[model samples]
Target chain A: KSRIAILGTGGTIAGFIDSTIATTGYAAGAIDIDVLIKAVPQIRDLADISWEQIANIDSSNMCDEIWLRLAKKIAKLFAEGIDGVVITHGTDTMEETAYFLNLTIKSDKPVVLVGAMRPSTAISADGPKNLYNAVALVVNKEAKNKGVMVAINDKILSARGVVKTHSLNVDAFSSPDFGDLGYIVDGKVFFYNNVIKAHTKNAPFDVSKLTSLPKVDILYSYSNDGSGVAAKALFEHGTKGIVVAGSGAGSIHKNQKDVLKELLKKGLKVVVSSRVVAGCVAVSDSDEKLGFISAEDLNPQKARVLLMLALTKTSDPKKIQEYFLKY
Target chain B: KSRIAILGTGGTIAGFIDSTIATTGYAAGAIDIDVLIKAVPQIRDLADISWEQIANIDSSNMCDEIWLRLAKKIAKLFAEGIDGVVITHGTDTMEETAYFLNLTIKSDKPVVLVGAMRPSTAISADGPKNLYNAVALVVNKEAKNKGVMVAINDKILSARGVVKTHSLNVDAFSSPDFGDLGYIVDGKVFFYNNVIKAHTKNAPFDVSKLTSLPKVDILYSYSNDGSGVAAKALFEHGTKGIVVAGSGAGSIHKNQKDVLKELLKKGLKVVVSSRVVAGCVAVSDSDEKLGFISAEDLNPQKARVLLMLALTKTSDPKKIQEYFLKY
Candidate 1:
């Protein structure tokens, strides 16, 4: 058996409810790591499984502190002879955390994040099967060099493109480009599309020396837009950077754009992203000249994840713009 | 020949350039409607064409006045024996305008919006071919009731799920769900999926008498989200409603949710949307009781479109929540 580590950070996979039918009203991250392992006893045969509990909170309230601690811990674990890792994450923000780890973790060894739409108490709970598949992914030698992945509903997706599509369905996550990275049928993993984005050893983020992350926030744009006041408040309240989730292809509303122009003059770094899920942001030459960075094809939330790390390296918006093109 | 009307608006398709290499920096909508028709002379065989120039500016700067005027005019044209409508539009923000028309147009007649990534002055210009196919899409009687489509680079997509996914690609727009509504092969259309959203005649949005749209805005969520001040400012700035583009499955950060809860008490209608692009917002029972509505599966920008129309009918968040589910 391969020496694989099961890291439980908590999600609906570990959630509990009194009534089996009531999936909506439950406490997420309720149980400990041992209960999850006992529920999926078959996974122990695939790996000499060692387990640890990271955090136990509803991922809606997920903060930067957990991310910093988790990344540092994962890298340290890899150095200490852990061949592979499977993270039990909350499905809601699993994609965000996956991308964060994709940029920060400096290992080519396989890493998979698994989450369930239904709580453990629900009928035909998917967590046990997903947990079992996650173990199979890390143990397979062929599953190396791929970036951090989210495996759910028999599909494997790269951290860059996977999105939580449906709120309540069992098949909640998907790669919007229709190009999934791989698939899992029972314990067998099938590989497909190769992601081209920089990840693992290629990504330049390192958080080992840091206790806290730079403060970055996101703002969205729409018709009759008037959220410039929020931008001003965030900057005044010690925000290091801001990511504008522009309406389409990073197109910001004029009302917000004009104020953002003023904020750029006051030494604020702004990265333009899309509120739409699947597109790249179009940053004009004139806007780039005024110190506005482009998030390229990243969504607002994932763009925030990059911007916070991007800030740790450089303060110049022009240098930060280069990061969007690469990682 | 089918009766068709070609509506011209500003986009890269009708732009003027100093060099064929200069696609990005060009004057959009510099040429008139007649010039566009003269370039695509072959389209005359498919339809008895009538044309109008609605406005001439880049679509990223698209305003609500044109949206209101254009929706009213399209309905009038359909009433007066127009069989199909093809609009030459800007790809940036085309999806937004298309969704607005999808809900407000009140017709079963075909509508196809055509745009180009490269300007008309480029060497291998795609506009003539795209414009030709857009005419074919509308003229084909089979194109009816597809809820207003966007035809570009030979792919046809419905307004509800289609998004501008690339910043500078000819194949920029794609339905992230991977299932495209249809495809165009050399001016012939092949449909693949039936879109089941409430649209056209089924959509209850009628903007015929209104001079302006309601004041609704969007704000995004992140790890250290501080846009709650942005939410408060939007409310104070005469805004009627707000859509929080929460991170994944509509998970709003505590920083913003607390302020939104206070705003709901202060008579502000808030709809939860996901920043991740594809998923439905998961509003809890307690949240809904406190007047939080879910933007079932719509993005923040499109969710704002329904919220603007929803406010015109009722101020009750519970009823407004139903509009999100239906529309």
Candidate 2:
């Protein structure tokens, strides 16, 4: 049996409720990590497991501080020679945190993020099955070096590409641009397309020395003209960078564009990301002239994370734009 | 052969490229309606075609006026005894326009919205194949009374449930919560589930007398708050409704939630829609008390279309919430 570490960072999978009837209004991150391992006895057949709770809070409350800590912990585990690591996170920020780990944790050891929509007390609780599948995925030799992944509802998604599309359903996460890396069939991991984007050791990010990330904010653009006001506010608040979640194919309103131009002139970096769930932001020649960067397939939240890391390394807009294209 | 009306509104399907190698940077809505039809002569075998251009612009430029015109035109066609209707549209606003028709058309006839990601002039263009599938879906009796539907990349989705998840990919449309109603195989439609939502004749909407639609705007929400400024602006601009594209399970930021609660008190209908591409928005008891409605499975854009139509019937928050749950 492979030695696997189960790191619990509190999500719906470890959630609990007094009654089985309620799905929502349950306390997330209520159950301890050891009890979660015991609930899924099938995982024992797949791996020799060691478990620990990194922190216990709903993933919506996940922040950069926790991400930094989690990455460091996983790195230590890998150095100790674990075959794989499975993290139970809240579905809300699971994609963001997984993407974070994909960039920072440098290892070939399989890293799988798993969560459930229903609480452990609810009927048809999905945590056990999903937990079982995640353990199975981590043990499979084929999953090595596939980068960090989110496993749930029988689908295996590359963390860099996946999003929690739905809020409450069992099948919440999806890799829209690229479909799933593969899926679990009869408790076995099936292989498909490997993620081509840079990740793990290949990605140009190392958080070992970093205690915290730079401050970057995302401003969303919509039909009405409030983007200008928020853009100015975020700039005044001392953010080093801003990601505008634009409508359609990252088209910002005229009013928002004017404020962003001013922000670019003020020596802060700007990345145009799409509010549209899937699709890359194509950078125009004018965008380059304006000293703006495009968030190539990254969503607004993920773009915010990348921009934070990129700013820590360089302030050159062209170099930052290249980072968007490559990572 | 079945009598099918092919209504063309401009999009990439009717788009053109000068060079065979170029896919992006091409002009959309460049080709005429007749040329698009002749390119896919296979559609003729599926139905006796009568075609017309509704408008010639990319769907990103689609507005309430075009939706009203399209809905009125569809109502008339159904009155004239057509077996089905197939609409060629831009993928950007295809889901919004299809949902608009779903609420207002009030007919049992099959209505299919088809679009392409690649320009028709490009090699291996998706327009011809998508058009063929739309025709196949329209002529099939199984598609009748399923409300308006989007047929693309061989997947058939209910108008209310589908969205353009990916902006550039051929398989752009998906129903994240419910998945596809069915998929086309061997040039035949195989339906797995009919939409259970109230739609067509069963839905409580009528646009027969409407020449214009009420003003409704969508405001997207992301990290570090931009929604409050927009919320106040839209209210002052006399918008009847606002759909907040909130992050993570339709969860609103604290600052934005305070503004939305105030807007609800001030009498504009507010809908909490998830920026997350898929999953249903769970309506909590606290949300009910706040007088804010949840856009169950509809995305922000689709929620705007539904809220616009629902406002046409009633302004009561409870009634509006009921409409959201039903449709």
Best by lDDT: 1
Q: Which ten residues in a row have the lowest lDDT in candidate 1 chain B?
A: B274-283
Docking class of 2: acceptable
The parts of candidate 1 lying over 4 Å away from their true place are: A18-25, A79-81, A106-109, A142-147, A154-156, A160-162, A165-169, A174-204, B1-3, B19-26, B75-83, B106-109, B141-147, B153-157, B165-169, B172-198
The residue-by-residue lDDT of candidate 1 on A33-63, one tens digit each, is 7799998778889989998999987777778
Q: Between which residue pairs do clashes occur in model 2? A: A165-B278, A166-B278, A166-B279
Tell me the deviation in Å of residue A157 in model 1: 3.8
Residues B1-327, candidate 2, lDDT per residue (tens digit)?
A: 789999999888988878876767666788888889998778889889999998887665676667888888888988897889999997767777888888888889999999998888889899998898899899997877888899999999998788777667777778867678999975789999977888889987888888777777766554444457656765775778888777667777656678888888888888888878766776578887878888887888788888888888889889988888888
lDDT per residue (tens digit) for residues B260-303 in model 1: 98999999999988766455567888989999999877877778
Best by DockQ: 1
Provide the lDDT at A49 for model 2.
95
In order, what DockQ does each candidate have? 0.45, 0.26
